[PDB]
Ligand binder design. Structure first.
Ligand SMILES: [Mg+2]
Ligand SMILES: [Mg+2]
Lengths: 231, 231, 231, 231, 231, 231
């Protein structure tokens, strides 16, 4: 494959998908037994290790739907991945959410043309695999984590033209903004595999607040634990 | 209100929403204590009764997003309804589903312009209220009913131009076709209320099969029981 | 059919199409000889009787393009209807129109996706059958009725977000708003049959004025008379 | 006014609109009393003369909505024109029409972006002023001319990328294709003035037949007569 | 060929394309040796003459993409034209441009549906043949003429519904507005032939300035020279 | 910035923009004097060094418009970059192009929503800064390099559903496919800065041919030399 150079059995069927290749490294080193790097092309780190005697992989996807789609396609179609859990950060767009809240994306809105191209002006809703969603939720519950299940926005545009770019979305119940989930949910459905996006609130886009570095790591770790128990 | 003529406290905050006004009558008469009709305008029957000492209403919506939107708007904005559960039939579009399967709509795709008008070519995903979804699922589980949680299509078009109209949708994991859920999910989110669509598979649009009348009533009743326990 | 349960001979070639099935009842009882009900499915009354020795049917369609298309499709394809006349009410969006004016829809604008889906972004203009339009206009003339012939908007959206939702339409000469005509006109052309939409202004959406129940009854009766003579 | 250089008053309220400036010359030289050329800018001939005691003007529009729009706008906004009748040829796209048939455009479909830009994906139907449509039809009737009243398509594209480009339009009852009507009807509505488009079938885009030069002049003469009597 | 009635061979491979047929006349009478009028159909003058030992033609296109497309198609497909250079005027939409500036269109933005229809909402960029763009620029440079190379907008709409209609285009670096370039560049690419659009600023749509008639002739002369040397 | 952690003075005004951060490393180490890393966030290497006594930076952008827009936005708005040159690889979609050809993007087509969101259905053409384009072309000439100047497609979609996904683009003269240029060109115009995209054909998407690692290295080096001389 042009983007992941690894032999065909190097990647586990269950895989975590941070955007940041360094977070992949971080996850492999801190939560997996015997993590072995399988990819370095474009610095996009991927590792395979074990969790409770089962193989788990972790692969950076980069930012945005076009980048993540590349890795997801290759993982599913070339490496046989079946359970794909994105673990990431998001910006909250409602005051009802607080920093360090966990968001489990039931579905993903988008401003990408990904589905407009294919459904030609009809509306396709990219969704999480229910069983995975339900599990993550109960895992988060058992740990007493503040968790919300609902809509996220997958945007192509981190930096906006004008202010209040997310006002309409929030008025329609969207919880948070990130850049990958709509791509993951769409491709998982196309391929008949199972997917979930879990997110940690790092920035509040309404209150202006941002978490401190240590606060991120603490809740990030919790998120990883949920993700691993969700598999 | 032009479409529901009832005094302001006649409708319960929790309400079931069949498309067929006669099914509303059927539900009120068979599952509620002391059902009292509150509306007859356009023959669109609505009733209020009790279930386990709590008020529940049941209101026919008619067919299609424009019709249902009218009633839903009036129920939420004029009558204070907060928990809205659509109970209906759907046509299966995947062989993985069988007749009499229960479908709980996690989200609703659409070919309506409802959201194109508002989001102007961006993609909004109308979704169920998670807590309601999760409850219905566990209720259905406890009864050993065959149940699927996932995507439905809310179409404007019952009768299609050409054959295989649902092939692309099915290839993207959509389970079943009906005509209201995308409207309900969108408006519930706009108003900040809670909503769920539960469906019974009456027709299989791939296998051509249709259920017998008695088979419908039997599984229909089960669906109503789930809906009532979901409130 | 799933929606009209009658033998193929029960429905006449010429049919009136109110939105309200109770107005179907009113029409049939007060204007047809020997009116006989042929449909009760979903409380959507349809009747067949005679006018001046010839059979005429009257069928409720429900509200909105998706509901009305179901009935229209079945009437044309399963029952052999060839002359379809919508009779209904509308809200005026221009001060030129006064309450109780008759509007004959020469064409129908829409915010529905019905044709966008079909003509992919090109513009199709749904129109009345000219011969019917001309005859209806002459019938209204002959009664000294204030009548306008022109554009109406068929909307999916009864309740609007923002104020002044119709001002652009009005600026472009659109007379009144209702919810079905674009559907009727598009399907009639698709099937090669004849259609017209006649409307009475029951509400003024600019002045906020409204008609008394007695007032709409009297002009409604006059409209029915026009429609019956147009057949 | 850049595109028409004439003093105010040199143009009559009532005006015929051929696409071809030389057909304008023909009209003024053969049907109008004391024709006076009021415009030569860009070879786009415009004349004023008299017909049966009233001034009538005739102005070439060029081909296409963008061209005709320029002239229509200036005529209406700068010169005070109130009644605008396009006279032209069209290609028939249904075998129902024979060569030399007269078509009176009740409405005009389009593949231009003229209204898409303005109504952002909502569908506006550009229509003829009913009074002119009605008078034109009666004029044709009493002359015994074969005449059809219905939809035309105003295309941006004379020469098409693929074959059978008019197949979908024809299936939805569209009669003929030309290039200006939708712009005329839209601008007339915008400006609150009156318009009609009358066309003779010079080409049959289905049978591949064409009229002889003698037949064109003959039926073209009849059309002008109808238009002048309609005006 | 309906729109140009000339024998094959009467038109040279290299051709200038003014919008105005009378500007074609001016070009042929002032710059070409032994100019011969080859077309009079619709007053759309087309000439062939010689320039420095080679045949050069000059053909009026009319205004707008639909009009120019007709001529461009016939010229290329029926007469064998290979090098097509539009020469015209434009309105400047940025204060960076002064009156009488020369603009060479590297690409052409548009609000026409020409490509939307073809690429269904994907974005195609119509561009100049680089070799002609490069030669035209060098010709202008050595004459010391103030010249800009960048985007123009080919609009369908001379007269706009609202004020500041070019504000967004200008913010994205668009230099000037005209009405044909995008059609020319698109058709040239489709046909595998070579094209350029060169324009002089006659109007400043920001400052509201205009050139005198003497200034127009002067800078227009320079433009033609550049074009003939580019060809 | 969230994505580039460097003080404002560490980045040069003139910057090269590979997609691959390892190619950023390669460029900096082999073509710049005193290369110094300024960024490691998300493994997206950026370096600053000198070329012929002047500072030049080199920054990985990642793949796709959304990823590259993040970097471009930050470089321009936070670091004061004014000359941005993308250097990358592309797949040829025409037989005219051969492996190892240099392509200089005069403009960039796209299937991204980036501009649709902004210009709502109108067509904006993202273009190169002409001065850079011209200089890069001359640099390539001077090395006897096979070079083409024209259109590229910036796609969101590396892996396609159907075969022959690029044939319409090619039929319209598009040379090659990559994933960033439309983003770069649009943002550079938005911000009033200067940009260019130079590409080497590493793959042929028609013949299915591919280059050896040695082959792409040698022509890649030549491209870098062109880019450095273009600054
Ligand atoms: Mg009669
Ligand atoms: Mg140098």
């Amino acid at each position: 494959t042009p983007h992941i150079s690894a032999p065909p059995g190097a990647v586990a069927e269950a895989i975590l998908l941070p955007g940041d290749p360094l977070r992949a490294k971080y996850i492999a080193e801190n939560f997996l037994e015997n993590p072995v790097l399988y990819n370095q092309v474009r610095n996009m780190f991927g590792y395979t290790g074990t969790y409770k005697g089962k193989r788990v992989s972790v692969q950076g996807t980069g930012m945005g739907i076009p980048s993540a789609s590349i890795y997801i396609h290759e993982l599913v179609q070339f490496y046989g991945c079946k359970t794909l859990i994105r673990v990431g950060t998001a910006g909250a767009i409602t005051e009802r959410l607080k920093l360090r809240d966990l968001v489990i994306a039931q579905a993903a809105c988008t401003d990408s043309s990904i589905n407009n191209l294919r459904f030609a002006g009809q509306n396709y809703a990219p969704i999480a695999t229910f069983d995975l969603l339900r599990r993550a939720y109960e895992q988060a519950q058992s740990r007493g984590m503040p968790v919300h299940v609902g809509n996220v926005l997958s945007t192509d545009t981190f930096y906006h033209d004008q202010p209040n770019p997310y006002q309409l979305w929030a008025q329609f119940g969207v919880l948070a903004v990130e850049m990958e989930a709509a791509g993951l949910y769409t491709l998982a459905a196309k391929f008949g595999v199972q997917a979930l996006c879990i997110l940690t609130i790092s920035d509040h886009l309404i209150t202006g607040e941002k978490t401190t570095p240590q606060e991120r790591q603490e809740t990030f770790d919790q998120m990883i634990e949920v993700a691993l128990e969700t598999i």
